[PDB]
CSV table of C-alpha atoms in Angstrom, one decimal:
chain,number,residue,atom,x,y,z
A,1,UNK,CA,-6.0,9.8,29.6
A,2,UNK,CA,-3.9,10.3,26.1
A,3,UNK,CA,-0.2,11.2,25.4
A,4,UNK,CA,0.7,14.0,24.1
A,5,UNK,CA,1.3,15.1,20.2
A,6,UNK,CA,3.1,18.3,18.8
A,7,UNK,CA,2.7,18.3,15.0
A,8,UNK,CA,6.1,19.7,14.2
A,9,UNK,CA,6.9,21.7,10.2
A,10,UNK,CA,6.3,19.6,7.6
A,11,UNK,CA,8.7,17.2,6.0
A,12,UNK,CA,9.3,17.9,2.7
A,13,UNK,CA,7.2,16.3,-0.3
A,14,UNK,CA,8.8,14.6,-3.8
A,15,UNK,CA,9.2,17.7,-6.1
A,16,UNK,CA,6.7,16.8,-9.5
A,17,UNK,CA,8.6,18.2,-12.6
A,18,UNK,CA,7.0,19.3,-15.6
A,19,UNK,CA,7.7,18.2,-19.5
A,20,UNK,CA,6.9,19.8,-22.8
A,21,UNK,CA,7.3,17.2,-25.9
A,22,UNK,CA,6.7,17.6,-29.4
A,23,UNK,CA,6.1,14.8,-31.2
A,24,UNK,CA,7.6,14.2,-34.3
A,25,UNK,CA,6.3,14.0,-38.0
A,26,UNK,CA,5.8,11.3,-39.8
A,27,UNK,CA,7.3,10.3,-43.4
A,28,UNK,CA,6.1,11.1,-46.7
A,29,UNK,CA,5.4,8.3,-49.3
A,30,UNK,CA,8.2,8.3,-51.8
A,31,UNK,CA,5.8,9.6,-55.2
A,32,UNK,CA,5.9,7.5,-58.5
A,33,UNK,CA,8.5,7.5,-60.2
A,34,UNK,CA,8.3,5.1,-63.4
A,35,UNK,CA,10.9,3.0,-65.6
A,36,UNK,CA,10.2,2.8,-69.2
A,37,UNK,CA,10.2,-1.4,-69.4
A,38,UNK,CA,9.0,-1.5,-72.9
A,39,UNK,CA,11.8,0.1,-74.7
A,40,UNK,CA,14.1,-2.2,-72.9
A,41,UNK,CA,12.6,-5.0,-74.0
A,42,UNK,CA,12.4,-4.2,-78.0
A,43,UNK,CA,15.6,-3.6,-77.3
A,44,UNK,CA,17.0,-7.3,-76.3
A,45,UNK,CA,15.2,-8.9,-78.6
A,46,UNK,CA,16.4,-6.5,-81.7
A,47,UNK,CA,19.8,-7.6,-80.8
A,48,UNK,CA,19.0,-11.0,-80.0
A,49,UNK,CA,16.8,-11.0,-83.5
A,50,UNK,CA,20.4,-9.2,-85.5
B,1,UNK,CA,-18.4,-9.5,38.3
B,2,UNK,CA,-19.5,-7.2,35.3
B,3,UNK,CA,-17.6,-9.2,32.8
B,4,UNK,CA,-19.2,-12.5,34.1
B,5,UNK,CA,-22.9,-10.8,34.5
B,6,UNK,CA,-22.2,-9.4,30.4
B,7,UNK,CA,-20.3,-12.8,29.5
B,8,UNK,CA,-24.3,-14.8,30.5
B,9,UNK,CA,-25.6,-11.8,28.1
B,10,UNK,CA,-23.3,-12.9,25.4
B,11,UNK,CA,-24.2,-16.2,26.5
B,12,UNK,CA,-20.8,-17.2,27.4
B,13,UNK,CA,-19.8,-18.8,30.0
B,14,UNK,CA,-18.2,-17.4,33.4
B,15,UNK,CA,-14.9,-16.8,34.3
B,16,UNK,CA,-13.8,-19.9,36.3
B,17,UNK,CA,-11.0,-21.8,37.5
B,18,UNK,CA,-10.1,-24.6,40.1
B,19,UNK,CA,-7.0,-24.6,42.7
B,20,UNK,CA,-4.9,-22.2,44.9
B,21,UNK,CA,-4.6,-19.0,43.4
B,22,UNK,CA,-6.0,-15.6,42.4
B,23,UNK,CA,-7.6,-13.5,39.6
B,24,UNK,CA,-6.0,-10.7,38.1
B,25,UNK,CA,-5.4,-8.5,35.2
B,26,UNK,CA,-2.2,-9.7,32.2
B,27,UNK,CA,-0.6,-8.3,29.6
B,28,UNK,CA,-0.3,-10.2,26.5
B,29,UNK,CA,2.9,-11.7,27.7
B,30,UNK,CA,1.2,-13.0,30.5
B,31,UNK,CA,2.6,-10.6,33.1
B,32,UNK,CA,0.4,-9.6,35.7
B,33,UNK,CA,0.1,-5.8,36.6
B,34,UNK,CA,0.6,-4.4,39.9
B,35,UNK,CA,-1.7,-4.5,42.4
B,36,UNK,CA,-1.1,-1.8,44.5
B,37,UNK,CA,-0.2,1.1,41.7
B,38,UNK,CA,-2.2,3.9,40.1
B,39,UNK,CA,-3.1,2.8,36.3
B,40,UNK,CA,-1.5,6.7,35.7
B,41,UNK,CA,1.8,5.4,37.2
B,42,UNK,CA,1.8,2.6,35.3
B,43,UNK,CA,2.2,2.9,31.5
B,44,UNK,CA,-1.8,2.7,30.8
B,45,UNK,CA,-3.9,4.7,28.3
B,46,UNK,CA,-6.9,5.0,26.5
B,47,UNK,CA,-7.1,2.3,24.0
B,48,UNK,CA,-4.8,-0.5,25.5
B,49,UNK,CA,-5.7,-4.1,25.9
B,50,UNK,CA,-5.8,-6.5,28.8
């Protein structure tokens, strides 16, 4: 002998919610720019040389 | 009588017990059942343990 059982609607399940993501771009290496040092230094020692 | 004829199987010893008294069937609490009472009147199913 067993009791009895009446499987009743279904409870409701956690909702899963979706996400669409794009990633971001990475930075670009600042290019080359380049001081003229030489001149500079003729320069101090012209005046230092005067 | 079957529980002490399967209990030598096992090779276990009998059920036994000295003094005034009587055997009978508890519930974990120790509370006997009735004695005169339908196991279907009392709250007995499949699967219970005594």
């Amino acid at each position: 002998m067993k009791r009895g059982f009446a499987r009743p609607t279904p409870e409701k399940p956690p909702v899963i919610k979706p996400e669409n993501i794009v990633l971001s771009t990475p930075l670009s290496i600042p290019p080359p720019e380049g001081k003229p040092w030489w001149l500079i230094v003729v320069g101090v020692v012209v005046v230092g040389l005067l | 009588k079957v529980v002490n004829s399967r209990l030598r199987e096992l090779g276990e010893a009998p059920l036994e017990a000295t003094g005034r008294g009587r055997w009978a069937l508890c519930l974990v609490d120790g509370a006997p059942l009735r004695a005169t009472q339908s196991l279907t009147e009392q709250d007995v199913y499949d699967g219970d343990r005594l």
